[PDB]
């Protein structure tokens, strides 16, 4: 009863670590998208003018 409880709690902590990783990837998407919009909306028009 003690070892199975501990293993279950260990898997729970690992899942929480994966969830934080999932949040990291979501913010990485925002960062890359921010760079794209900056190039298309600020850099490219500045070169064409």
């Amino acid at each position: 009863r003690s070892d199975i409880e501990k293993l279950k709690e260990a898997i729970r902590d690992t899942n929480k670590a994966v969830q934080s990783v999932q949040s990291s990837i979501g913010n990485l998407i925002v960062a890359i998208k921010s760079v794209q919009d900056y190039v298309n909306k600020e850099i490219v028009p500045s070169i064409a003018r």
């Binding site: 999932q22 998407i29 890359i32 070169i47």
Partner: protein, 36 residues
């Protein structure tokens, strides 16, 4: 003069697919943990 904009919003929405279908196995594991 021939500078088309970059559009990777294809692979980005590929990443956002992989991430949502990770989140929906995570909720799968935590299903089997709440099972115990």
């Amino acid at each position: 003069v021939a500078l088309d904009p970059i559009d990777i919003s294809x692979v980005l929405n590929x990443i956002k697919x992989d991430l949502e279908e990770s989140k929906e196995w995570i909720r799968x594991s935590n299903x089997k943990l709440d099972x115990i």
